[model samples]
Target: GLFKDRRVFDENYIPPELRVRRGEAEALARIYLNRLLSGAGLSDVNMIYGSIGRVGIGKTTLAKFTVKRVSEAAAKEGLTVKQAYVNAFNAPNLYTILSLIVRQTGYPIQVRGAPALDILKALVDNLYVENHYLLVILDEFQSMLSSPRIAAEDLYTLLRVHEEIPSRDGVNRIGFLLVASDVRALSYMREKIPQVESQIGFKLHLPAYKSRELYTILEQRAELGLRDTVWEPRHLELISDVYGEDKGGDGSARRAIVALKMACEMAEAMGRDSLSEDLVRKAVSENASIQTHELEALSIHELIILRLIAEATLGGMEWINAGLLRQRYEDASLTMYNVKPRGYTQYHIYLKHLTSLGLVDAKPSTTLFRLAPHLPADRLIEVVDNIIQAKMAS
Candidate 1:
């Protein structure tokens, strides 16, 4: 009887009240209203806003919530606004991205031989014909920017849609909100549309949650997510404190929510009436294992780097010096793959990707790095070796 509605702790669940980041949601709401209802037709408004923050800092949640809010509000006011959210990571190229937007907007267009520009123009033109406004949210937009096949021209064409396909009614019809973990990735888009620098409006930087904020967040979720018989304020506080300490008290709400759910499951298994601090403590390791499972999505090069880290740090300190780690990385690649490994520069890039995925920890000093604290070297080695062996067998 620990959980009444477990879905509350689910990462994807969007509560009506997002306790933290009130300022961001409010600020975005104002912008959405102005942009969505502007009589000037979006020419005077800065259409593109990029959100930057740490992983699990609620960037995607905020964007999605704002879009939903604006769409609902517009509908109330007798306005016709169509909103579509897409993960740009999946839409790597211009054509793919356009195809996704077309599908989301319910636009009827031939997909075969359809030029990206032509598809975009037709999409915009059709929206205008229908007297509908459009808001397209591209989450994890950095992936699109980082793709080798997606050039600056592709970005420019997408952003400049308003100008290329203007409506006779002269109302702002299309706008975009780009969300990414690093807002600086906009430099890629800026490089393409240098002249439109002034047009890109505001940047919303959502800072990481503090301890108290995270506690309040978990408290709200407990009330909504669990049965009252099993919920306790102290248990939520303990979970919040531990999670806050995990990443230097940046207080990742995602991790705390996950730990809470894990603790509930543990309590239920043991036939306990309510969650205990001790149970929450044990759940931390389980929650981290779930996080490490994300490593399955890593590339072969990434796994090799992780394999090298595990090798160097074996039977040693939890942390390894970067110089020594790189040396081992190079040596292991040659010995294991029989191919020249990437240079130090590429290795550094991979480390960043690994760190972001919570698979490893790369401190700001850049000299010391280590596997995730929750993951032991032996366990990581086991996981990596199993994968490598399977690859060899195949």
Candidate 2:
């Protein structure tokens, strides 16, 4: 009797209505999407681009919501618009990524085993002839940039679709809206792909969800999810305080929402009539899955470095020195992915990047690196192995 509609808490369920200051955020994003939709016949446009916040801050939801609104607005003007929301981290290969966009463009081009550029060629030409526009929201774009400066071709397939494939009289029809957990990844993209520097037209930076903002949104969720026995006001407040950045929490709405759902499940299992702070406390303690997706965003080399650190930390090594990690890198990389192991300079770059992302801790004074405190190596490797297999097929 604890849930009236449990789907509200499911990450897959995009709410019919998004409240809690979402208007301002969506309005800002609409500035780009609306103009992109309105600029259909303009031959002068390159690509409309944007970036979002870190893990679990409603980045995906915001992008999709904005697309939904802009398409409706586009339809009113007698323009046909299509949207495709793809997550690069989950795809098997770059072709799969391109295939996904083709699938959504509703372009009747047979992309079955078609090369990446070929698919883009057909899609752009078809959209141009059919007089339709497309807006593609690419989530988890970090993976493409994480590789060894090899994503230039990948970028050309997506961003340079207008020019690389040649549109009629330079009439651009497709729009791209990018969402990545790390905005800094764009800097890497710009340096590696010189043309990318001028191609990005729109960039949006989303701040972390603060305590009060978290409470306001969770209240809406509780109203939709709970049965006649709704949650106490204190229940939602406690969740916000624990996860909101204002109170030393990581400020992840996804994690807070997840912990709240777990707490509700706990109360239901215990047949409690009212939620307790103790239950919420336990819920936060059991929030390990929060970091799993973020871990999946690491590059293969970064994963090897992380896996090596995880192996050492799990083997009871403290402050695992870089010297030993350097030795282990080749074996792990070559055996698992057959990457032939990058150089120590590149290896050290991987270390600093992982450290910068806070996935690995660094003590340069002693040249040591280790998994974050209490992060079990086995669990990390479990996630890493899955990504490796997915990438292998890729």
Candidate 3:
């Protein structure tokens, strides 16, 4: 084996020691602990906290790391925190979301064919009776919120669960950690239920890691995912630079980790015992094509926005402004797709999603946007055309 433990490079594997964002991780742990231990001394509100970050910015990893630490701290205090996490993208509607919560929380029996509120109540009752603080994490929560399958009432019911079913002692027994790529999820909730803004107790923002922070994360993962002599600090520096230095770079440690793993595999294939600069460069080059799969995963709304980016580029525009994009998207949606376009807010959100997928580059200070340099204009237009044609055919 050319690696110590290849699992270290896995995107879903949360390292026990979070190297760069220890402070943020600890703050989250404290919030969870405070909510879980509110019964003893510290009285806190029913916490509906929202955490937002870019893709591969270690959002889920930071969450798992914080929850693990919170569990350990609760053990020291002789308190038990029962936690359940569901990827909302997989559990789109209220029924599936409730079913996942029931399954993950180990409900006595699977409740089927029940109203969302009833299933939620049963789950809450079980947790309260068991005397465990329930922490529910809804990852990719924006997908759930935006999904037409999930009604507005479903979100209202889910958010107000704590208030509707209080514990015997009148303490808030359940806490929510809603995770998404940006504040758009929170705004979506507020748009649906105006009071949702007031209900959310705390909001945490996770910024993209800087080059230094990303380099530290890469170095730490290298120690566990690579052999002792496989890579040096300079090798990690090169990977981090590629991972974080771009104008559209997400500073995703996930990207750096994947690059390392791919480079190691490349080295092994070449019968090399250690990683070389050439292998690293090749790995980064290969990594640029990784977002094509994400393109296939996008929603129709996202696909339209992405296609419009290609449209802008192929139309001899150096940069696409938001107003121009909105107009083009609206026209395309009505004329081509025969559906009303998403409004400006949602249009901006879709752009963020595309940026997260590396399909486009959206700078904050400017309304102007550009296609990702690595993604070719012809290829993107081809993808969009095929998708549009298939949609029309269907």
lDDT of each: 0.71, 0.72, 0.72
Ranking, TM-score, top scorer first:
3, 1, 2
Cα lDDT for residue 364, candidate 3: 49
TM-score of each: 0.71, 0.69, 0.75
Q: What are the per-residue Cα lDDT tens digits for candidate 2 across 1-394?
A: 6888999999977776778546744664466455655564422212222222235667777778777776777788787777787987777566788788887776678988798777877877887788877777878776766755435776765676666666875767777677767556677767777676467665666666789988987888888887757578888888898777667566778888888899989998998866788998888788733365666677778887888888888877867877778878887788767888998788888899888766677888659888765355687888887887776677
Per-residue C-alpha lDDT of model 3 across residues 24-132, encoded as one tens digit per residue = 7787778768656654521222222222324577667766677678768888988877767888878768888888877877768557678777887777667667767
Measure candidate 2: CA RMSD. 7.5
Give lDDT tens digits, candidate 1, residues 91-112: 7688988888888888787767
Give the higher-lDDT candidate: 1 or 2.
2
Relative to the true structure, candidate 2 reaches a TM of: 0.69
lDDT of 3: 0.72
- Candidate 1 stretches with Cα past 4 Å from truth are 42-53, 190-193, 196-198, 245-250, 288-394
Q: How much lDDT does candidate 2 score? A: 0.72
